[PDB]
Short mmCIF file of N, CA and C in Angstrom, two decimals:
data_model
loop_
_atom_site.label_atom_id
_atom_site.label_comp_id
_atom_site.label_asym_id
_atom_site.label_seq_id
_atom_site.Cartn_x
_atom_site.Cartn_y
_atom_site.Cartn_z
N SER A 1 11.86 4.57 -9.38
CA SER A 1 11.30 4.70 -10.48
C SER A 1 10.58 3.85 -10.95
N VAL A 2 11.51 3.24 -12.07
CA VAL A 2 11.52 2.30 -12.66
C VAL A 2 10.52 1.19 -12.70
N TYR A 3 10.79 0.87 -11.65
CA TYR A 3 10.80 -0.87 -10.89
C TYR A 3 8.94 -0.12 -10.31
N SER A 4 8.55 1.31 -9.98
CA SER A 4 7.36 1.21 -9.99
C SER A 4 6.48 1.14 -11.15
N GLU A 5 6.69 2.17 -11.62
CA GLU A 5 6.08 2.96 -13.64
C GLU A 5 5.62 0.96 -13.65
N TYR A 6 6.76 0.33 -14.15
CA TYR A 6 7.07 -0.93 -15.07
C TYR A 6 6.00 -1.80 -13.59
N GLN A 7 6.28 -2.07 -12.18
CA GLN A 7 5.83 -2.34 -11.43
C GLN A 7 3.23 -2.39 -11.97
N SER A 8 3.29 -1.33 -13.00
CA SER A 8 2.10 -0.79 -12.45
C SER A 8 1.49 -2.00 -13.88
N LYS A 9 1.74 -2.58 -14.08
CA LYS A 9 1.42 -2.99 -15.42
C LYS A 9 0.35 -3.81 -15.61
N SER A 10 0.66 -3.83 -14.58
CA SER A 10 -0.38 -5.61 -14.26
C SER A 10 -0.50 -6.90 -14.88
N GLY A 11 -0.02 -6.58 -16.52
CA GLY A 11 -0.01 -7.57 -17.64
C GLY A 11 -0.67 -7.98 -17.58
N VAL A 12 -0.88 -9.61 -16.78
CA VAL A 12 -1.84 -10.24 -17.33
C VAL A 12 -2.89 -10.06 -16.21
N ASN A 13 -4.38 -10.44 -16.27
CA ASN A 13 -5.61 -9.91 -15.31
C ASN A 13 -5.05 -10.11 -13.73
N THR A 14 -4.53 -9.05 -13.24
CA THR A 14 -4.28 -8.99 -11.97
C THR A 14 -5.42 -8.77 -10.88
N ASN A 15 -5.36 -8.66 -9.70
CA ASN A 15 -5.99 -8.23 -8.19
C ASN A 15 -6.82 -6.84 -7.84
N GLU A 16 -5.60 -5.76 -7.72
CA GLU A 16 -5.71 -4.64 -7.18
C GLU A 16 -7.65 -4.41 -7.21
N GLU A 17 -8.08 -4.30 -8.51
CA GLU A 17 -9.19 -4.10 -8.39
C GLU A 17 -10.11 -5.18 -8.65
N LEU A 18 -9.96 -6.22 -9.14
CA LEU A 18 -9.88 -7.28 -9.91
C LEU A 18 -10.91 -8.12 -8.23
N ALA A 19 -9.96 -8.08 -7.35
CA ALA A 19 -9.91 -8.45 -5.94
C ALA A 19 -11.59 -8.23 -5.65
N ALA A 20 -11.61 -6.40 -5.69
CA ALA A 20 -12.62 -6.22 -5.68
C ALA A 20 -14.15 -6.70 -6.02
N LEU A 21 -14.38 -6.76 -7.53
CA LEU A 21 -14.72 -7.72 -7.90
C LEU A 21 -15.33 -8.85 -7.07
N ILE A 22 -14.89 -9.59 -6.66
CA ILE A 22 -15.22 -10.63 -5.96
C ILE A 22 -16.28 -10.77 -5.31
N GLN A 23 -15.91 -10.07 -4.26
CA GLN A 23 -17.41 -10.06 -3.46
C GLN A 23 -18.89 -9.63 -3.81
N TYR A 24 -18.65 -8.93 -5.62
CA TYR A 24 -19.45 -8.18 -6.29
C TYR A 24 -20.87 -9.91 -6.60
N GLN A 25 -19.72 -10.88 -6.72
CA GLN A 25 -20.10 -12.26 -7.78
C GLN A 25 -21.53 -13.13 -6.94
N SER A 26 -21.56 -12.79 -5.64
CA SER A 26 -22.92 -13.23 -4.94
C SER A 26 -24.43 -12.70 -6.00
N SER A 27 -24.09 -11.66 -6.56
CA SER A 27 -25.01 -10.75 -7.29
C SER A 27 -25.75 -11.50 -8.17
N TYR A 28 -25.02 -12.51 -8.76
CA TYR A 28 -25.87 -13.42 -9.91
C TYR A 28 -26.45 -14.84 -8.86
N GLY A 29 -26.34 -14.66 -7.94
CA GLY A 29 -27.25 -15.93 -6.92
C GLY A 29 -28.22 -15.51 -6.84
N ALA A 30 -28.40 -14.36 -7.23
CA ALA A 30 -30.23 -13.96 -7.26
C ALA A 30 -30.37 -13.58 -9.03
N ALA A 31 -29.67 -13.74 -9.83
CA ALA A 31 -29.90 -13.73 -11.33
C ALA A 31 -30.04 -14.80 -11.26
N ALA A 32 -29.54 -16.00 -10.97
CA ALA A 32 -30.25 -17.44 -10.86
C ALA A 32 -31.34 -17.85 -10.40
N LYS A 33 -31.77 -17.02 -8.95
CA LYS A 33 -33.02 -17.41 -8.48
C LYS A 33 -33.92 -16.73 -9.50
N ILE A 34 -34.42 -16.23 -10.33
CA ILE A 34 -35.46 -16.23 -11.61
C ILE A 34 -35.06 -17.14 -12.22
N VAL A 35 -33.67 -17.70 -12.29
CA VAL A 35 -33.41 -18.70 -13.36
C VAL A 35 -34.41 -20.04 -13.32
N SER A 36 -34.27 -20.25 -11.75
CA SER A 36 -35.18 -21.17 -10.93
C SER A 36 -36.70 -20.48 -10.75
N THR A 37 -37.47 -19.21 -10.81
CA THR A 37 -38.38 -19.22 -11.10
C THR A 37 -39.22 -19.61 -12.39
N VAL A 38 -38.11 -19.70 -13.36
CA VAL A 38 -38.87 -19.80 -15.06
C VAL A 38 -39.19 -21.62 -14.62
N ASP A 39 -38.47 -22.24 -14.06
CA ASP A 39 -38.74 -23.24 -13.84
C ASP A 39 -39.63 -23.54 -13.40
N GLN A 40 -40.19 -23.05 -12.16
CA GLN A 40 -41.61 -23.45 -11.26
C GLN A 40 -43.07 -22.27 -12.28
N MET A 41 -42.12 -21.62 -13.58
CA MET A 41 -43.22 -21.50 -14.04
C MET A 41 -43.49 -22.90 -15.46
N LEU A 42 -42.40 -23.35 -15.60
CA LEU A 42 -42.82 -25.13 -15.99
C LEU A 42 -43.96 -25.54 -15.49
N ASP A 43 -44.36 -25.49 -14.00
CA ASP A 43 -45.17 -26.27 -14.11
C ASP A 43 -46.82 -25.67 -14.49
N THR A 44 -46.92 -24.33 -13.91
CA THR A 44 -47.93 -23.69 -14.88
C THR A 44 -48.29 -24.63 -15.94
N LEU A 45 -47.13 -23.91 -17.18
CA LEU A 45 -47.37 -25.19 -18.57
C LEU A 45 -48.01 -26.75 -18.55
N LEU A 46 -46.69 -27.16 -17.45
CA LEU A 46 -47.98 -28.96 -17.58
C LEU A 46 -49.07 -29.03 -17.13
N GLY A 47 -48.95 -28.06 -15.74
CA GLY A 47 -50.59 -27.91 -15.27
C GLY A 47 -50.82 -27.97 -16.45
N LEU A 48 -51.37 -27.72 -17.59
CA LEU A 48 -51.95 -27.04 -18.77
C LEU A 48 -52.66 -28.46 -19.20
N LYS A 49 -51.65 -29.59 -19.38
CA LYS A 49 -51.70 -30.56 -19.98
C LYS A 49 -52.79 -31.44 -18.92
N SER A 50 -52.19 -31.36 -17.76
CA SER A 50 -53.13 -32.15 -16.49
C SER A 50 -55.03 -31.86 -16.18
N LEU B 1 56.84 26.58 17.00
CA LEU B 1 56.65 26.09 15.72
C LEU B 1 55.99 25.34 15.60
N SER B 2 55.82 24.31 16.79
CA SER B 2 55.04 22.71 16.67
C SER B 2 53.85 23.71 16.51
N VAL B 3 53.12 24.90 17.52
CA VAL B 3 52.22 24.66 18.38
C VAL B 3 51.59 25.02 17.19
N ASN B 4 51.68 26.26 16.35
CA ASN B 4 50.87 26.84 15.23
C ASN B 4 51.07 25.16 14.05
N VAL B 5 51.45 24.70 13.91
CA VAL B 5 51.43 23.39 13.16
C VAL B 5 50.12 22.36 13.56
N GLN B 6 50.05 21.99 15.21
CA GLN B 6 49.46 21.62 15.80
C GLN B 6 48.11 22.22 15.31
N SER B 7 47.71 23.42 16.11
CA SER B 7 46.52 24.17 16.25
C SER B 7 45.93 23.90 14.95
N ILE B 8 46.49 24.45 13.63
CA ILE B 8 45.92 24.44 12.32
C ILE B 8 45.66 23.43 11.79
N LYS B 9 46.58 21.91 12.42
CA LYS B 9 45.85 20.89 11.94
C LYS B 9 45.25 20.36 12.93
N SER B 10 45.19 20.92 14.00
CA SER B 10 43.84 20.70 14.47
C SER B 10 42.45 21.79 14.15
N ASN B 11 42.59 22.66 13.90
CA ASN B 11 41.79 23.22 13.56
C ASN B 11 40.82 22.94 12.06
N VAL B 12 42.36 22.30 10.98
CA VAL B 12 41.55 21.67 9.67
C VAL B 12 40.16 20.20 10.27
N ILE B 13 40.72 19.76 11.46
CA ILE B 13 40.31 17.84 10.87
C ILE B 13 38.88 17.53 11.71
N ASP B 14 39.18 18.75 13.58
CA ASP B 14 37.93 18.22 13.99
C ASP B 14 36.79 19.43 13.58
N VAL B 15 35.73 18.83 14.66
CA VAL B 15 34.49 19.12 14.33
C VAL B 15 33.72 19.65 15.24
N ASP B 16 32.69 20.49 14.92
CA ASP B 16 31.86 20.90 16.42
C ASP B 16 30.48 20.22 16.86
N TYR B 17 30.64 19.38 17.74
CA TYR B 17 29.09 18.56 18.05
C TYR B 17 28.08 19.27 18.21
N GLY B 18 28.02 20.73 18.35
CA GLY B 18 26.65 21.28 18.19
C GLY B 18 25.97 21.48 17.38
N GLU B 19 27.03 21.60 16.41
CA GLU B 19 25.89 21.79 15.23
C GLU B 19 25.27 20.43 14.80
N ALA B 20 26.35 19.44 14.61
CA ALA B 20 25.30 18.31 14.34
C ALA B 20 24.78 17.60 15.47
N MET B 21 24.60 17.87 16.51
CA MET B 21 23.45 17.78 17.21
C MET B 21 22.32 18.14 17.17
N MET B 22 22.01 19.22 16.75
CA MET B 22 21.54 20.00 15.88
C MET B 22 20.10 19.23 15.25
N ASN B 23 21.17 18.48 13.85
CA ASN B 23 20.62 18.15 13.03
C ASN B 23 20.43 16.76 13.84
N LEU B 24 21.41 15.68 14.53
CA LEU B 24 21.19 14.64 14.72
C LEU B 24 19.40 14.75 15.84
N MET B 25 19.58 16.05 16.69
CA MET B 25 17.97 16.47 16.87
C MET B 25 16.86 16.49 15.68
N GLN B 26 17.47 16.87 14.80
CA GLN B 26 16.53 17.17 13.93
C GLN B 26 15.88 15.76 12.63
N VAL B 27 17.53 14.98 12.64
CA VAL B 27 16.72 14.35 12.57
C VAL B 27 15.94 12.66 12.59
N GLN B 28 16.18 12.59 14.17
CA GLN B 28 15.59 12.10 14.84
C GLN B 28 13.82 12.50 15.16
N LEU B 29 13.42 13.03 15.13
CA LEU B 29 11.94 13.71 14.88
C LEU B 29 11.79 12.85 13.03
N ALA B 30 12.27 13.38 12.56
CA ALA B 30 11.71 12.89 10.58
C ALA B 30 11.70 11.53 10.86
N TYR B 31 13.31 11.08 11.51
CA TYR B 31 12.22 9.33 11.54
C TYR B 31 11.55 9.20 11.83
N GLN B 32 11.16 9.62 13.82
CA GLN B 32 10.51 9.61 14.58
C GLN B 32 9.49 9.76 13.75
N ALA B 33 9.26 10.81 12.95
CA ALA B 33 7.31 11.18 12.42
C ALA B 33 7.37 9.70 11.10
N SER B 34 8.39 9.17 10.46
CA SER B 34 8.82 8.44 9.67
C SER B 34 7.91 6.77 10.43
N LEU B 35 8.16 6.85 11.38
CA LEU B 35 7.43 5.58 11.74
C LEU B 35 6.10 6.16 12.02
N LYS B 36 4.98 7.19 12.40
CA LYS B 36 4.13 7.09 12.54
C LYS B 36 3.48 7.34 10.96
N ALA B 37 4.00 7.38 10.48
CA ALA B 37 3.58 7.14 8.86
C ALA B 37 3.59 5.69 8.78
N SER B 38 4.31 4.90 8.58
CA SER B 38 4.43 3.64 8.40
C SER B 38 3.09 2.87 9.71
N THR B 39 3.19 3.62 10.71
CA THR B 39 2.24 2.72 11.47
C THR B 39 0.37 3.25 10.86
N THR B 40 0.91 4.66 10.14
CA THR B 40 -0.78 5.27 9.30
C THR B 40 -0.58 4.30 8.38
N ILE B 41 0.13 3.12 7.60
CA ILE B 41 -0.12 2.55 6.88
C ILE B 41 -0.74 1.23 7.46
N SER B 42 -0.63 0.50 8.74
CA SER B 42 -1.59 -0.44 9.27
C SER B 42 -2.86 -0.07 8.65
N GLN B 43 -3.63 1.48 8.44
CA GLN B 43 -4.49 1.37 7.99
C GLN B 43 -5.14 1.52 6.45
N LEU B 44 -3.95 2.03 5.79
CA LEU B 44 -4.23 1.77 4.91
C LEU B 44 -3.72 0.49 4.43
N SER B 45 -3.46 -0.43 5.09
CA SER B 45 -3.94 -1.90 4.43
C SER B 45 -4.90 -2.54 4.37
N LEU B 46 -6.16 -1.27 4.81
CA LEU B 46 -7.56 -2.32 4.11
C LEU B 46 -8.27 -2.19 2.73
N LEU B 47 -7.50 -1.46 2.18
CA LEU B 47 -8.39 -1.27 1.30
C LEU B 47 -8.38 -2.16 -0.04
N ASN B 48 -6.70 -2.59 -0.23
CA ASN B 48 -6.13 -3.52 -1.26
C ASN B 48 -7.17 -3.78 -2.26
N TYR B 49 -7.66 -4.59 -1.29
CA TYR B 49 -8.31 -5.59 -2.75
C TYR B 49 -10.00 -5.63 -2.33
N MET B 50 -10.52 -4.91 -2.22
CA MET B 50 -11.71 -4.98 -1.03
C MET B 50 -12.97 -4.43 -2.54
#
């Protein structure tokens, strides 16, 4: 029991749930998608110099 | 005289097998159930890091 309870600590950031979040990260790839669209908007911007 | 000594000597030390058999039957099933519980752990193994 002392092992089990103190095995709980996680100390540093560990993986039980932290492991779950990894699959989620891809969502930012969608966030990056917009950032590219912002650059596409620069086409509209400099198009106005042309 | 030796008869009484030998009888009581035996009466003191030796055990019945049937009583143990009941327990022996009893434990083997529980120990059997233990495996099935462990086999269940195989399915439990899917979640930890998802």
